[PDB]
């Protein structure tokens, strides 16, 4: 299971982060957590994967960070256009299910 | 007569993430006071068997050396831990001696044992073989009683997906060719399940691996001289006159 | 990449519904396919995934639909199917056709979902 | 993970030459069983004033063994020049059942300096260094001798005052003349006795530091040290491996003047050793002052049966290799060093199979 | 060894009374005789007082006895009325 | 077994006494004299319970 803040907010131009916590098997040992962004009425899109890097369709405002068993999504110089529901997603290989957090209102 | 020392420290076992079957950890105890019950008390044991030694003796006699091999193990796969196993796990991941006295313990971990962490999933290797220099002929590569999988250096700390195939070429020293492997996963249960192998060695050194016992002042050699007595000297028992 | 999804609608609990989608812009026979759902007021929930034909096209399912939903695919059409053998009222959600890929290598892998379709409503 | 100190900070390795023709010499010193030469004492039990048979890991009688030597490096007056070693770095051999080595074989004798065709010198004892592991291949330039993953490394240090052993991953440095750099030849250890062997302050890290100049150490599991009494007494050292890990034997700590080898240490190495090599070593001495060094000889062990003569002091002085020849077997058959005259039967000679037919 | 066929041809293997294999019909149609590899019996001539010895090689023709036979190997030899002695 | 591998003669070792004698010596040619042979077994009638 992944635990996220109910909501994260700030003014345009400010830096905010969205946490995503778990245990050693979720975050600590492997760099396998991804982040998604969903606009109302739309499908989610991939912002960051493997706790490290983003798709070329994603702006530099979005970067990953990890410490201990906590993963997070950093939005540097947030814009009003970044308002969305963000999700933390954990998934390994076989013999396991895909785990999503409850989502964060950003 | 026995020497005093320290109690056997099983904290390492209980203070980290359980190893994989094909990459287990080995704790060797020499010159030490052991307590098998103390250790097993911490686990909800599922089974306990031995060969060429009783379940009693394994917890009460003195040894020249005691070896504990521990690793994560799906409970349901116990059918392949038999000496006369089918082979899917036994012949590649982990085998035990049939020539030395040995025991096997299968147990689950209670919620209170929070010092030992839980793995993502269980992994094991199902295939492991060598290819010859002709890149056509293959020969199986099996693991022995006190060895690690012959292709342990090829397979990663975990099998991400069933069928993941691994390969490396070999240097001339081994005759060249390629060494290859393939494994699979098993879903993790609600509680951690774990297995422990025990090997007992006798007669190669002073049998100073013993339980912890107290004593009286009437069990010394001195003042017993000339009389027929029973004795136990650093694990060496018998009867005679000093 | 476009994932075209349809087959939603309203079916009373106890009945059944099948969704399908078509992939274009990718090599169907060389990708993994999957499904997720999202009910109003809820976050994202995994339904299941299907492997490639060369891999036996095996499947894995989320616990919420274990033993109820089945996945299949057909490379002659480049389409994916999700059949809901027995619907519950709780299955009211928007479903999304998606793809699944891995990064890194065999030694150290990382899995994520790159593409998502328009989605369809099941109610 | 064990902290084994900082990495070397040099931008380049010290060049080491290989002129093999200067090392192509031999002074045969085969195992003489009649003197219990290379016999490892039984670990579990002692005896006194008896003759019995015993099975264990022993060298073959008559085995010449593999001779290895170390030499002085080049020098111009008081300024040392590049190193000088034999082609040992590529000499990767099977570990098998383990081995024993004779140390100080020619101590006190008169010999010569390897790098000087006509310079005499007194021969002094020097300790061998080893590298052991489970898998070996090439360096980036295709040269042989690169060990992979964790390796067991044994380095006598402090000019023969301590033995250090450790188990770490070797990470080759990329500087000039280094294992993973340009113009690579080989690697070697060395010391500079001018300052390293100071009587009032031995450089107990001289050899270790030299080693680091070629390879960095990572993910170390352990590191141990043992002290060495400094003298010129001939001694034996041995290494074997079992389920209990790696066993180190030495005659020095029990039977210094008798030669019987006893176990003195065990290392927690449960990774099967398959290959090993002899580590090169050069001494960066002054051109006007060079020494000769005793050769050391490496012998293989086998699961053989010997007849052992236990003296009244509990030490073994004589032994018979029961499989060496026919007469030898006869003494073993009677479990005695005294057999009456006559004609006795012995084991037959047998021909081993040639190429199979299918 | 190359030799004359005996027994009934259909069966590839010819056995002795002791149930040991003594002959075989090869894929090439030829018949061969088969015997266990023979060893060389040895005895030791030992004289205690002079601390010496000699090796007597059973009943060998002394054709198969090379020098350097003083060891099992894991003056030369001469043939006598007894066997070959080195 | 003849030299050509064919069986030309055989003895049924359970037929009678003399037949067994030849089998006992694994030969079709035995010496004269008086020899012991397998005894005649008794056979039971209906059981008693
Ligand atoms: C290079 O050269 C060095 C010397 O420069 C040489 O080392 C020396 O080796 C000799 C042996 O050849 C050492 O001398 C003695 O060796 C015996 C070993 O046992 C043998 O001799 C006894 C004698 O009865 C036999 O019974 C036995 O079976 C063996 O044959 C040692 O036991 C001796 O120890 C004495 O000194 C100890 C010091 O504490 C005493 O504790 C011990 O009781 C002995 O003392 C007795 O002898 C002394 C002799 O002077 C005497 O003074 C005492 O009062 C007392 O009687 C002794 O070691 C010689 O010591 C070695 N040198 C050193 C510094 O140890 C190297 O071997 C040579 N290297 C090569 C390769 O050739
Ligand atoms: C015992 O020791 C052996 C070596 O002696 C270890 O195995 C070696 O492990 C190293 C890595 O730790 C291997 O080196 C290289 O690893 C790369 C892994 O992928 C990462 O880097 C790539 C770079 O672009 C990224 O894209 C990727 O996402 C990862 O970040 C490989 O990609 C390298 O492959 C290179 O050579 C092959 C040869 O054909 C080319 O095809 C590739 O394109 C590329 O050029 C490389 O593998 C090293 O090769 C391993 N050696 C062996 C023999 O396996 C063992 O793991 C160690 N034992 C244990 C248990 O750890
Ligand atoms: C010659 O080489 C030896 C190699 O062993 C080297 O000694 C080692 O130095 C390193 C440091 O470079 C030591 O590693 C650590 O150093 C810090 C320094 O403050 C210590 O605090 C560390 O202590 C740990 O281990 C202790 C063990 O009981 C713990 O009690 C403590 O809480 C820490 O866990 C640690 O020492 C390394 O330990 C030493 N090695 C030894 C055996 O001491 C030596 O200095 C080199 N000599 C020269 C002249 O360079
Ligand atoms: C062998 O030793 C090397 C070197 O110590 C180990 O590599 C190191 O592993 C640690 C993880 O324990 C890495 O930690 C780093 O922490 C910072 C802190 O914020 C983080 O930002 C980094 O991303 C990373 O997590 C450390 O970087 C890493 N060092 C290198 C050079 O990669 C190695 O794991 C050891 N191997 C074993 C089997 O112990
Ligand atoms: C070996 O371990 C067992 C279990 O921990 C010890 O038995 C316990 O000893 C304490 C001592 O106060 C008693 O209070 C417990 O009731 C004992 N438990 C049981 C199940 O009897 C045992 O004493 C240990 N052995 C030694 C020598 O200390
Ligand atoms: C070591 O054993 C030998 C015999 O193998 C002992 O020598 C014998 O001692 C007895 C004592 O009465 C004599 O009768 C024998 O004739 C001796 N045999 C020989 C060949 O001399 C020797 O004394 C023992 N040594 C010790 C210290 O016990
Ligand atoms: C180091 O060089 C020596 C000398 O060329 C090599 O030893 C020779 O190996 C050949 C191989 O058949 C033998 O026939 C020679 O008799 C050997 N000579 C000596 C003096 O031993 C040695 O193998 C080389 N080592 C390496 C690692 O290349
Ligand atoms: C690793 O080094 C060995 C030699 O130490 C290479 O094997 C030699 O390759 C040459 C190429 O012409 C052959 O002539 C030699 O006979 C080979 N030696 C042996 C023992 O086979 C080996 O190919 C090297 N491996 C790599 C990957 O470079
Ligand atoms: C080897 O002997 C040296 C003797 O100098 C030991 O180092 C000394 O250890 C004592 C403590 O017992 C310290 O007070 C000294 O200062 C140490 N000497 C130096 C130069 O530091 C050394 O520990 C011994 N090593 C082994 C493995 O026994
Ligand atoms: C193997 O044995 C057979 C049988 O004796 C040999 O075949 C005979 O060869 C001679 C040579 O002149 C012919 O005259 C015979 O007629 C052959 N016999 C048959 C049945 O054909 C055969 O040549 C032998 N093979 C070898 C290699 O010696
Ligand atoms: C030992 O030497 C004697 C020397 O006479 C050999 O006897 C001679 O052997 C030759 C062999 O043809 C005969 O022709 C002589 O007539 C023999 N001489 C006598 C006097 O008998 C004898 O054979 C040699 N022994 C062996 C085993 O070779
Ligand atoms: C459970 O763990 C706690 C430590 O957090 C310990 O104090 C307690 O005694 C443990 N209970 C049992 C039954 O072991
Ligand atoms: C043994 O004797 C010593 C002598 O002081 C005494 O202190 C000790 O308690 C005695 N032990 C027993 C078990 O009586």
The domain ranges of chain A are 1-106
The Cα B113–Cα B127 span in angstroms is 34
CB of A91 less than 8 A from some CB of B: no
The Cα D108–Cα D232 span in angstroms is 8
Q: What's the sign of the alpha-carbon dihedral C84, C89, C94, C98?
A: negative
Ligand 7 near D20 CB (within 6 A): yes
Angle (CA) C51 C57 C58, round 5°: 80
State whether B161 and A93 contact (CB < 8 Å).
yes
Q: Which residues of B121-150 are buried (b: 16+ CB within 10 A; e: fewer)?
A: bbbbbbbbbbbeeeeeeeeebebebbebbb
Which residue matches tokens 């894995």?
C60
The DSSP string of D305-349 is EEEEEE-TTS-EEEEEETTT-HHHHHHHHTTSS---SEEEEEEEE
- CA A35 → CA A58, A80, A101, B155, C111, distances in Å? 12, 19, 10, 29, 12
Pocket test for ligand 6, best of D47, D48, D310, D312 (most atoms within 8 A of CB): D312
Contact between residue B181 and residue B93 where contact means Cβ atoms under 8 Å apart: no
Report which ligand 1 atom has the smallest distance to the Cα of D231: 64
Ligand 1 near D234 CB (within 6 A): yes
Pocket test for ligand 5, best of B8, B35, B39, B214 (most atoms within 8 A of CB): B35
Q: Which two tokens stand for residue B56?
A: 């009693």
State whether D149 and B201 contact (CB < 8 Å).
no
Report which ligand 8 atom has the smallest distance to the Cα of B169: 27
Contact between residue C119 and residue C57 where contact means Cβ atoms under 8 Å apart: no
The Cα A86–Cα A35 span in angstroms is 7
| D343: exposed, middle or buried (Cβ count in 10 Å: 0-12, 13-18, 19+) | exposed
State whether C110 and A49 contact (CB < 8 Å).
yes
The Cα E65–Cα D344 span in angstroms is 19
Contact between residue D248 and residue D264 where contact means Cβ atoms under 8 Å apart: yes
Select from D199, D27, D196 the least CA-distant residue to D107: D27
User: CA of D47 to nearest chain B CA: how many angstroms apart?
Assistant: 15
Resolution (A): 3.6
- CA D172 → CA D179, D184, D215, D263, D279, distances in Å? 5, 11, 4, 33, 15
User: CA of A59 to nearest chain B CA: how many angstroms apart?
Assistant: 30
Q: What is the 3-state secondary structure (H, E, C) of D268-314?
A: CCCCCCCEEEECCEEECCCCCCCCEECCEEEEECEEEEEEEEECCCC
State whether E71 and D353 contact (CB < 8 Å).
no
Q: Which two tokens stand for residue C21?
A: 């989608």
Cβ neighbour number for residue B196 with a 10 Å cutoff:
21
User: CA of B169 to nearest chain A CA: how many angstroms apart?
Assistant: 26
**For chain C, how far is it from start to end, CA to CA, in angstroms?**
27
Conformational region of residue B150, where left means phi above 0, alpha means psi within -120 to 50, and beta covers everything else: alpha
Q: Which residues of D142-153 are buried (b: 16+ CB within 10 A; e: fewer)?
A: eebbbbeebbbb
CB of B156 less than 8 A from some CB of C: yes
Q: Sort out which chain D residues have CB atoms less than 8 A from B171's CB and list them.
A: 136-138
Contact between residue D71 and residue D80 where contact means Cβ atoms under 8 Å apart: no
Which residue matches tokens 């033995």?
D163
Ligand 3 near D223 CB (within 6 A): yes
Q: Whose CA is nearest to atom 26 of ligand 9?
A: D227
Select from B83, E69, A75, A70 the least CA-distant residue to D346: E69
Q: Which helix (H) or strand (E) holds C123?
A: none
Calculate how far, in angstroms, residue C14's C-alpha sits from the geometric centre of ligand 7: 83
Q: Whose CA is nearest to atom 33 of ligand 4?
A: D219
Calculate how far, in angstroms, residue F29's C-alpha sits from the geometric centre of ligand 12: 90
The Cα F16–Cα D18 span in angstroms is 91
State whether B28 and D268 contact (CB < 8 Å).
yes
Q: Which two tokens stand for residue B61?
A: 């006699």
CB of B116 less than 8 A from some CB of A: no
Q: Which residues contact A68 (CB under 8 A, 6 or more apart)?
A: A27, A28
Cβ neighbour number for residue B200 with a 10 Å cutoff:
21
Calculate how far, in angstroms, residue B42's C-alpha sits from the geometric centre of ligand 12: 10
3-state secondary structure (DSSP) of residue C64 = helix
Q: Sort out which chain B residues have CB atoms less than 8 A from A23's CB and list them.
A: 117-118
Quick one: how far is CA D232 from the chain centroid? Answer: 17
The DSSP string of B74-131 is -GGGGGG-STT--STTTTTT----SSS-EEEEEEE--TT-TTSPPPSSEEEEEEEEEE
What letter would DSSP give residue A26? I
User: CA of C84 to nearest chain A CA: how many angstroms apart?
Assistant: 19
State whether B120 and A94 contact (CB < 8 Å).
no
Q: Which two tokens stand for residue B223?
A: 């003042």
3-state secondary structure (DSSP) of residue A25 = helix
Neighbours of chain D (3+ CB pairs under 8 A): B, E
Contact between residue B27 and residue B8 where contact means Cβ atoms under 8 Å apart: no
* Side-chain half-sphere exposure of B99, counting CA atoms within 13 A: 4
Ligand 6 near D312 CB (within 6 A): yes
Candidates C44, C112, C117; nearest CB to A49: C112
Q: In what order do the strands lie in the sheet with D50-58?
A: D50-58, D302-310, D316-321
The Cα D47–Cα B219 span in angstroms is 26
Window B:72-131, CB contacts with D under 8 Å = none
Q: Which residues of C34-59 are buried (b: 16+ CB within 10 A; e: fewer)?
A: bbbbbeeeebbbbbbbbbbeeeebeb
Which residue matches tokens 């065990």?
D266
The DSSP string of B152-215 is TTTS-SS--STT-EEEEE--GGGTSSEEEEEEEEEPPPSS-EEEEEEEEE-SSS---EE-----
Please tell me the total number of residues recorded for chain D in this structure.
358
3-state secondary structure (DSSP) of residue F17 = helix
Q: Whose CA is nearest to atom 15 of ligand 8?
A: B172
State whether B160 and C109 contact (CB < 8 Å).
yes
Starting from the CA of residue D47, give the closest ligand. Answer: 6
Q: Which residues contact E47 (CB under 8 A, 6 or more apart)?
A: D341, E53
Q: Sort out which chain C residues have CB atoms less than 8 A from A30's CB and list them.
A: 108, 110
Contact between residue B64 and residue B202 where contact means Cβ atoms under 8 Å apart: yes
Q: Whose CA is nearest to atom 16 of ligand 7?
A: D24
Residue pairs between chains B and D whose CB atoms are closer than 8 Å: 34
Residues with CB under 6 A from ligand 9: D 225-227
| B206: exposed, middle or buried (Cβ count in 10 Å: 0-12, 13-18, 19+) | middle
Q: Which residues contact A52 (CB under 8 A, 6 or more apart)?
A: A31, A64
Residue of C nearest to A92 (CA): C111
The Cα C79–Cα C70 span in angstroms is 14
CB of A103 less than 8 A from some CB of C: yes
The Cα D152–Cα D157 span in angstroms is 16
Ligand 13 near B216 CB (within 6 A): yes
CB of A86 less than 8 A from some CB of C: no
3-state secondary structure (DSSP) of residue C63 = helix
Starting from the CA of residue B10, give the closest ligand. Answer: 5
The CA R_g of chain E, rounded to the nearest whole Å, is 20
Report which ligand 9 atom has the smallest distance to the Cα of D204: 20
Select from B15, B234, B39, C8 the least CA-distant residue to B48: B39
* Side-chain half-sphere exposure of F25, counting CA atoms within 13 A: 14
CB of B17 less than 8 A from some CB of A: yes
Q: Which two tokens stand for residue C8?
A: 């939603």
Residue of C nearest to A31 (CA): C110
Contact between residue B185 and residue B122 where contact means Cβ atoms under 8 Å apart: yes
Q: Which residues of F16-32 are buried (b: 16+ CB within 10 A; e: fewer)?
A: eeeebbebeeeeeeeee
Which residue matches tokens 């060094």?
D293
Calculate how far, in angstroms, residue B217's C-alpha sits from the geometric centre of ligand 13: 6
Q: Which residues contact B101 (CB under 8 A, 6 or more apart)?
A: B50, B51, B52, B53, B58, B199, B200, B202
Contact between residue C112 and residue C101 where contact means Cβ atoms under 8 Å apart: yes
Q: Which residues contact D175 (CB under 8 A, 6 or more apart)?
A: D10, D11, D12, D13, D181
Ligand 3 near D162 CB (within 6 A): no
Calculate how far, in angstroms, residue B209's C-alpha sits from the geometric centre of ligand 13: 25
Ligand 3 near D220 CB (within 6 A): no
Q: Which two tokens stand for residue A87?
A: 């999700």
The Cα E75–Cα C35 span in angstroms is 91
Angle (CA) C97 C22 C47, round 5°: 25
Ligand 10 near E6 CB (within 6 A): no
Candidates A30, A55, A102; nearest CB to C43: A102
């Amino acid at each position: 299971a992944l635990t996220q803040p109910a909501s994260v907010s700030g003014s345009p131009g400010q830096s905010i982060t969205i946490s995503c916590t778990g245990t050693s098997s979720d975050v600590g040992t492997y760099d396998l957590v991804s982040w998604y962004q969903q606009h109302p009425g739309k499908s989610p899109k991939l912002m960051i994967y493997a706790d490290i890097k983003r798709p070329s369709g994603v702006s530099h405002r979005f970067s990953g960070s990890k410490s201990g068993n906590t993963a997070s999504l950093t939005i540097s110089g947030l814009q009003s256009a970044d308002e969305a529901d963000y999700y933390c997603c954990l998934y390994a290989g076989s013999s396991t299910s895909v785990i999503f957090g409850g989502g964060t209102k950003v | 007569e026995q020497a005093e020392g320290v109690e056997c420290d099983f904290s390492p076992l209980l203070s980290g993430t359980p190893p994989q079957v094909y990459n287990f950890k080995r704790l060797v105890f020499t010159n030490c006071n052991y307590n098998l019950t103390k250790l097993l008390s911490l686990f909800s044991v599922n089974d306990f068997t031995c060969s060429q030694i009783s379940p009693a003796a394994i917890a009460s006699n003195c040894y020249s050396s005691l070896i504990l091999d521990y690793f994560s193990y799906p409970l349901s796969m116990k059918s392949d831990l038999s000496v006369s196993s089918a082979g899917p796990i036994s012949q590649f991941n982990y085998k035990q001696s049939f020539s030395n006295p040995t025991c096997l313990i299968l147990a689950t971990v209670p919620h209170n044992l929070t010092t030992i962490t839980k793995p993502l999933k269980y992994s094991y290797i199902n295939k492991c073989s060598r290819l010859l220099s002709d890149d056509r002929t293959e020969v199986p590569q099996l693991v022995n009683a006190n060895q690690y999988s012959p292709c342990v250096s090829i397979v990663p700390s975990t099998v991400w997906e069933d069928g993941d195939y691994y390969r490396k070429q070999l240097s001339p020293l081994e005759g060249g060719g390629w060494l290859v492997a393939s494994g699979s996963t098993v879903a993790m249960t609600e509680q951690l399940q774990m297995g422990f192998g025990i090997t007992v060695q006798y007669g190669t050194d002073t049998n100073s691996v013993c339980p912890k016992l107290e004593f009286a002042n009437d069990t010394k050699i001195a003042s017993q001289l000339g009389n027929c007595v029973e004795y136990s000297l650093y694990g060496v028992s018998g009867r005679g006159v000093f | 990449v476009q994932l075209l999804e349809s087959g939603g609608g309203l079916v009373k609990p106890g009945g059944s519904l099948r969704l399908s989608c078509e992939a274009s812009g990718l090599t169907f026979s060389n990708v993994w396919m999957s499904w997720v759902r999202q009910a109003p007021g809820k976050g994202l929930e995994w339904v299941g995934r299907i492997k490639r034909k060369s891999e036996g096209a095996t499947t894995d399912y989320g616990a919420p639909v274990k033993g109820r939903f089945t996945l299949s695919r057909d490379d002659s059409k480049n389409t994916v199917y999700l059949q809901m053998n027995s619907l519950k009222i709780d299955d009211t959600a928007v479903y999304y056709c998606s793809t699944l890929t891995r990064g890194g290598d065999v030694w150290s892998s990382s899995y994520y979902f790159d593409y998502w379709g328009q989605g369809a409503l099941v109610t | 993970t064990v902290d084994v100190g900082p990495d070397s900070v040099k931008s380049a390795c010290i060049e080491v030459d290989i002129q093999q023709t200067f090392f192509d010499k031999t002074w045969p010193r085969p195992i003489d069983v009649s003197k219990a030469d290379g016999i490892i004492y039984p670990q579990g039990r002692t005896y006194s004033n008896i003759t019995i048979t015993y099975q264990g890991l022993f060298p073959y009688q008559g085995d010449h063994g593999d001779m290895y030597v170390y030499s002085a490096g080049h020098a111009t007056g008081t300024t040392p020049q590049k190193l000088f070693v034999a082609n040992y770095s590529q000499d990767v051999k099977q570990f098998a059942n383990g081995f024993v080595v004779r140390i100080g074989a020619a101590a006190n004798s008169t010999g010569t300096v390897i790098i000087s065709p006509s310079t005499s010198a007194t021969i002094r004892k020097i300790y061998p260094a080893f590298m052991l592991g489970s898998s070996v291949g090439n360096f980036s330039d295709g040269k042989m001798g690169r060990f992979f993953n964790h390796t067991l490394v044994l380095l006598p240090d402090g000019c023969g005052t301590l033995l250090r052993a450790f188990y770490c991953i070797l990470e080759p440095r990329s500087g000039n003349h280094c294992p993973a750099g340009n113009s690579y030849t080989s690697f070697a250890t060395y010391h500079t006795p001018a300052t390293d062997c100071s009587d009032g302050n031995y450089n107990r890290n001289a050899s270790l530091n030299s080693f680091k100049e070629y390879f960095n150490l990572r993910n170390c599991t352990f590191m141990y040290t043992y002290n060495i009494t400094e003298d010129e007494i001939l001694e034996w050292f041995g290494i074997t491996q079992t389920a209990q890990g790696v066993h180190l034997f030495s005659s020095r700590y029990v039977d210094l003047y008798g030669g019987n080898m006893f176990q003195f240490a065990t290392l927690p190495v449960y990774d099967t050793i398959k290959y090993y090599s002899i580590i090169p070593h050069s001494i960066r001495s002054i051109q006007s002052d060079r020494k000769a060094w005793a050769a050391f000889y490496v012998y293989k062990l086998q699961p053989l049966t010997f007849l052992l003569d236990f003296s009244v002091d509990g030490y073994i002085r004589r032994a018979i290799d029961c499989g060496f020849n026919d007469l030898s077997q006869l003494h073993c058959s009677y479990e005695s060093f005294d057999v009456e005259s006559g004609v006795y039967s012995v084991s037959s000679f047998e021909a081993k199979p040639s190429g199979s037919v299918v | 060894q190359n030799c004359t066929a005996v027994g009934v041809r259909q069966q590839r293997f010819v056995y002795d009374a002791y149930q040991n294999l003594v002959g075989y019909y090869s894929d090439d149609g030829n018949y061969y005789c088969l015997r266990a590899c023979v060893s060389v019996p040895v005895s030791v001539i030992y004289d205690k007082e002079t601390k010496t010895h000699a090796t007597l090689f059973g009943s060998v023709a002394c054709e198969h006895i090379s020098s350097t036979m003083s060891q099992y190997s894991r003056y030369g030899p001469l043939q006598t009325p007894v066997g070959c002695v080195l």
